[PDB]
Every structure is written in C-alpha cells, then in structure tokens.
Design an enzyme around this catalytic site. Structure first.
Site, mmCIF file in Angstrom:
data_model
loop_
_atom_site.group_PDB
_atom_site.id
_atom_site.type_symbol
_atom_site.label_atom_id
_atom_site.label_comp_id
_atom_site.label_asym_id
_atom_site.label_seq_id
_atom_site.Cartn_x
_atom_site.Cartn_y
_atom_site.Cartn_z
ATOM 1 N N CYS A 1 0.885 -1.164 0.000
ATOM 2 C CA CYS A 1 0.000 0.000 0.000
ATOM 3 C C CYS A 1 0.929 1.221 0.000
ATOM 4 C CB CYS A 1 -0.941 -0.025 1.229
ATOM 5 S SG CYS A 1 -1.406 1.613 1.888
ATOM 6 N N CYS B 1 0.739 3.663 2.942
ATOM 7 C CA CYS B 1 1.160 2.985 4.150
ATOM 8 C C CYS B 1 2.673 2.898 4.141
ATOM 9 C CB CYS B 1 0.598 1.574 4.201
ATOM 10 S SG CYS B 1 -1.180 1.397 3.908
HETATM 11 C C1 LIG Z 1 4.145 -0.650 8.496
HETATM 12 C C2 LIG Z 1 2.705 -0.774 8.031
HETATM 13 C C3 LIG Z 1 2.013 0.464 7.880
HETATM 14 C C4 LIG Z 1 0.617 0.441 7.668
HETATM 15 N N1 LIG Z 1 -0.117 1.627 7.402
HETATM 16 C C5 LIG Z 1 -1.540 1.763 7.280
HETATM 17 C C6 LIG Z 1 -2.261 2.916 7.009
HETATM 18 O O1 LIG Z 1 -1.818 4.092 6.768
HETATM 19 N N2 LIG Z 1 -3.661 2.841 6.773
HETATM 20 C C7 LIG Z 1 -4.463 1.711 6.802
HETATM 21 O O2 LIG Z 1 -5.625 1.434 6.434
HETATM 22 N N3 LIG Z 1 -3.670 0.648 7.187
HETATM 23 C C8 LIG Z 1 -2.308 0.561 7.429
HETATM 24 N N4 LIG Z 1 -1.594 -0.591 7.701
HETATM 25 C C9 LIG Z 1 -2.405 -1.743 7.947
HETATM 26 C C10 LIG Z 1 -2.772 -2.106 9.348
HETATM 27 O O3 LIG Z 1 -1.697 -1.962 10.314
HETATM 28 C C11 LIG Z 1 -3.418 -3.457 9.330
HETATM 29 O O4 LIG Z 1 -2.657 -4.645 9.494
HETATM 30 C C12 LIG Z 1 -4.886 -3.573 9.692
HETATM 31 O O5 LIG Z 1 -5.890 -2.519 9.586
HETATM 32 C C13 LIG Z 1 -5.608 -4.777 9.278
HETATM 33 O O6 LIG Z 1 -5.625 -5.068 10.677
HETATM 34 P P1 LIG Z 1 -5.800 -6.507 11.266
HETATM 35 O O7 LIG Z 1 -6.860 -6.574 12.270
HETATM 36 O O8 LIG Z 1 -5.875 -7.568 10.228
HETATM 37 O O9 LIG Z 1 -4.548 -6.577 12.247
HETATM 38 P P2 LIG Z 1 -3.429 -5.885 13.101
HETATM 39 O O10 LIG Z 1 -4.412 -5.098 13.902
HETATM 40 O O11 LIG Z 1 -2.215 -5.449 12.333
HETATM 41 O O12 LIG Z 1 -2.933 -7.286 13.639
HETATM 42 C C14 LIG Z 1 -1.619 -7.798 13.847
HETATM 43 C C15 LIG Z 1 -1.677 -8.689 15.063
HETATM 44 O O13 LIG Z 1 -0.770 -8.041 16.002
HETATM 45 C C16 LIG Z 1 -1.560 -7.656 17.135
HETATM 46 N N5 LIG Z 1 -1.559 -6.240 17.280
HETATM 47 C C17 LIG Z 1 -2.358 -5.185 16.765
HETATM 48 N N6 LIG Z 1 -2.022 -4.025 17.265
HETATM 49 C C18 LIG Z 1 -0.979 -4.271 18.158
HETATM 50 C C19 LIG Z 1 -0.140 -3.539 19.026
HETATM 51 N N7 LIG Z 1 -0.380 -2.230 19.115
HETATM 52 N N8 LIG Z 1 0.880 -4.066 19.801
HETATM 53 C C20 LIG Z 1 1.114 -5.400 19.806
HETATM 54 N N9 LIG Z 1 0.296 -6.158 18.943
HETATM 55 C C21 LIG Z 1 -0.715 -5.555 18.152
HETATM 56 C C22 LIG Z 1 -2.947 -8.309 16.997
HETATM 57 O O14 LIG Z 1 -3.298 -9.145 18.054
HETATM 58 C C23 LIG Z 1 -2.924 -9.187 15.837
HETATM 59 O O15 LIG Z 1 -2.631 -10.560 16.147
HETATM 60 C C24 LIG Z 1 -0.124 -0.841 7.729
HETATM 61 C C25 LIG Z 1 0.677 -2.014 7.800
HETATM 62 C C26 LIG Z 1 2.074 -2.048 7.951
HETATM 63 C C27 LIG Z 1 2.745 -3.410 8.065
#
Ligand SMILES: Cc1cc2nc3c(=O)[nH]c(=O)nc-3n(C[C@H](O)[C@@H](O)[C@@H](O)COP(=O)(O)OP(=O)(O)OC[C@H]3O[C@@H](n4cnc5c(N)ncnc54)[C@H](O)[C@@H]3O)c2cc1C
Ligand SMILES: *[C@H]1CC(=O)N(CC)C1=O
Length: 356
Positions: free
Chosen positions: A284, A287
């Site tokens: 993305c 991102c």
């Molecule tokens: C570097 C990077 C930048 C990104 N930038 C954007 C952006 O600008 N805009 C946008 O729409 N999305 C962004 N994303 C996407 C976002 O972070 C997602 O992964 C998310 O919205 C989809 O979330 P998810 O529930 O599948 O998991 P996440 O919420 O990423 O899940 C990852 C896992 O790690 C854990 N986790 C979640 N938060 C934390 C925490 N704070 N500390 C420890 N563990 C945690 C959870 O239990 C889960 O198992 C980015 C991803 C990356 C890798």
C-alpha cells in the site's frame, strides 16, 4: 498515570505543531519510488486487504488500491536539489569560508506532499500486512549475555507496539463511511484495535514521550538552520516554541535504557530499526510512505537518545548539527503522528462516553 501530563502538554501544542508540519520545510518527504523488498509474502489483493469492508460491494474508486494510492499531482522531482540531504550544519552559512555525499542512494527519489497524502484508512491488511508486522516483532532478538539484554528487547517491542497502535488509531479516526462517502471516526474499530487493549494505548504514550524527549534533548544544540531560507525563515524559531512546551518530569526516566544498555547493544538496537527496510515490502503506497517516515523517525530518535547520552558538549553539538534535514523531518513528522494519535484517544474516550 503520567497520561494526563502528556495530554496537557499535547493540547498546549497541537495547533503550533500542526502549523509547523504544514510549512514548506516539513511538508515534503523524499521517497524512492522503486522498492526493494529483500525480506522475501502474500501479494494478491485477496490477502492484502482488510476484511473490514465487503469490497466487492463498493464502487471501483473506493477499493483499497485507490484509497491507498498517492494523489498523483502531489510529488515533485527530488535530488534536483540536495536540501533534504544536507546537514543542519550546512543549511545556513555560519561563517565566510550532498545527496551523494551523505548516502541518499535512491533510484528514483521524489518529494511527496504529506499535506496532500495524510495517513488514513486505506483498506490494507490481510495476511500481507500480518506477515510484515509479524516479521518486525519476530526480529526482536539481540546478542545473549550482553548487559541490558532483556531491557533492549522490551524497549524494541514497546516502540514497535506504539508505532503499530498509532497507525491503528489513525485509520480508526480517519475512517471511510462507505454510505455517506465521508471520512469520520469509527469508535467501534478504535475499540477493537486499540480501545480494549490498555497496553497498546500505553505504548503510544510511551512512543510520544520517547520522541518528545529526543526533540527536547537536541534543542540546545540545534544549528540556526533556517534564518537564511527566505521562505522558511521562522521555522527554527517556531520549532523551539513547540519543543519548549514539551518539558516534563517524565524525561527524567531512562525511557530507552540509555544508561543501562551495552554500547554494542545500542548499535544492534539501532540496526534492528532494518524495520525501515521492510517498509519497502508494504504494497500500500500511502502505508509505505508513512511507515517509512515513522520508522525513520524512531531510528532517528534512538540515535539521538543513545548518542547524546554519553554527552560531551563538543560531541553533542556535533551529533545534532550533523543530523540531516531528512532526519529532522522524519522525527518531527513522527511526533506529529503521535500527537494526533494521543488526541484521537481522548476523542474516542469522549465518543465512547456520549454513547450513553
Ligand atoms: C508498516 C505498516 C504500515 C501500515 N499503514 C496503514 C495505514 O496508513 N492505513 C491503513 O488502512 N492501514 C495501514 N496498515 C495496515 C494495518 O496496520 C493493518 O494490518 C490492519 O488494519 C488490518 O488489521 P488486522 O486486524 O488484520 O490486524 P493488526 O491489527 O495489524 O494485527 C496484527 C496482530 O498483532 C496484534 N496487534 C495489533 N495491534 C498491536 C499492538 N499495538 N501491539 C502489539 N500487537 C498488536 C494483533 O493481536 C494481531 O494478532 C499498515 C501495515 C504495515 C505493516
Ligand atoms: C529471533 C531469535 C530467534 O531464535 N527467534 C525465533 C525464531 C527470533 O525470533
């Protein structure tokens, strides 16, 4: 506990910091359009999108591919000027007496307008995003035995967790209403990603303080890096104005264990942040952009806190002066994301309230 202090400090600064960040000096970021994902990873949209929305249901211009793309018309050619690559040392002439010279090895670098490309919900996620966050956390391994081994891993994890939470918080504040077609807060999502996980909120306040402590530590050694710029003459002053309102007893605590870490553990810690490299694996575009800015922001913060720690006035003055405009931009823009994340938490708490 100290949560309140940072909130007070942050509210007294939100406006000045937002203005500073919109300035010509801070509004642009140098980004290589070519990316080298050398750590590999799922590439299909089928595993790179978040389940949060039933995409096949929305219009074409609302798919993650568009929500996460740059605003085309917002990026001028870079390296046509080596301003971003210069040291704060050499922006203005201190006495009558660089992108190559300072290591900016970008294939096709450009300056993107951050004001026109804010971090917000893009629809990115799935296994890919998962594989990336997963790899960063799993790369929390230092040289055993070394003094402050545990501490190093705790700080590394905490910084990454706060970075992670900050983004989650952000996409929650700036969420898209697939019906009104309006960007607005999404309390339910905030609660699901950050709300119900106290540790995650704490980590943002941890990152906020780490970055704020760095800005505060360099303030005394900042070169008069802008009086000469006809357009950005006041920027240095306006930054001092913000940093000065940052003083807090919290800075007394050794947040990154500078006085407890081995001198080689400190370099390993700096090396782990590499985290900036995986950012090129982020498909993305927006991102990747903001991810890169924040990882660079943290790596800069760590460098500052670790190096200025050992002190020595000549050295301290050198460390801050030989800091590049690129780094200061990343550092202050990362503080900008944290400032807003902390503000968004307070908003969601008051939103979670009126719910009753
Ligand atoms: C570097 C990077 C930048 C990104 N930038 C954007 C952006 O600008 N805009 C946008 O729409 N999305 C962004 N994303 C996407 C976002 O972070 C997602 O992964 C998310 O919205 C989809 O979330 P998810 O529930 O599948 O998991 P996440 O919420 O990423 O899940 C990852 C896992 O790690 C854990 N986790 C979640 N938060 C934390 C925490 N704070 N500390 C420890 N563990 C945690 C959870 O239990 C889960 O198992 C980015 C991803 C990356 C890798
Ligand atoms: C880093 C060090 C180590 O052995 N692991 C588990 C595979 C890490 O994550």
């Amino acid at each position: 506990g100290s949560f309140n202090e940072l909130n007070a400090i942050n509210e007294n600064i939100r406006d000045d910091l937002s203005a500073l960040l919109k300035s010509d000096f801070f509004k642009y970021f140098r980004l290589d359009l070519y990316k080298q994902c050398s750590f590999w990873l799922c590439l299909n949209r089928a595993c790179s999108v978040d389940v949060v929305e039933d995409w096949d249901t929305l219009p074409e211009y609302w798919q993650p591919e568009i929500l996460g793309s740059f605003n085309n018309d917002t990026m001028k050619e870079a390296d046509d000027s080596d301003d971003e690559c210069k040291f704060l040392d050499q922006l203005c002439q201190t006495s009558k007496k660089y992108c190559d010279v300072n290591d900016f090895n970008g294939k096709n670098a450009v300056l993107i307008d951050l004001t026109a490309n804010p971090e917000r919900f893009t629809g990115y996620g799935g296994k890919q995003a998962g594989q990336i966050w997963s790899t960063i956390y799993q790369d929390n391994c230092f040289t055993i035995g070394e003094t402050g081994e545990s501490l190093a891993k705790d700080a590394f994890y905490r910084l990454v967790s706060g970075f992670h939470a900050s983004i989650g918080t952000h996409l929650s504040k700036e969420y898209l209403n697939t019906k009104t077609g309006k960007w607005e807060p999404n309390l339910d999502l905030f609660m699901a990603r950050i709300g119900n996980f106290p540790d995650r909120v704490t980590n943002m306040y941890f990152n906020y303080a780490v970055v704020a402590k760095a800005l505060w530590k360099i303030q005394p050694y900042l070169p008069e890096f802008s009086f000469c710029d006809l357009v950005n003459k006041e920027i240095k002053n306006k930054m001092d104005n913000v940093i000065s309102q940052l003083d807090t007893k919290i800075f007394n605590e050794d947040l990154v264990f500078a006085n407890d870490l081995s001198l080689t553990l400190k370099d390993e810690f700096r090396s782990r942040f590499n985290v900036t490299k995986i950012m090129d694996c982020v498909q993305c575009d927006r991102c990747r952009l903001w991810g890169k800015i924040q990882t660079t922001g943290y790596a800069t913060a760590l460098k500052i806190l670790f190096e200025i720690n050992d002190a020595d006035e000549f050295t301290k003055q050198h460390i801050v002066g030989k800091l590049t405009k690129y780094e200061l931009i990343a550092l202050l823009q990362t503080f900008g994301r944290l400032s807003e994340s902390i503000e968004s938490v307070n908003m969601f708490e008051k939103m979670y309230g009126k719910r009753l």
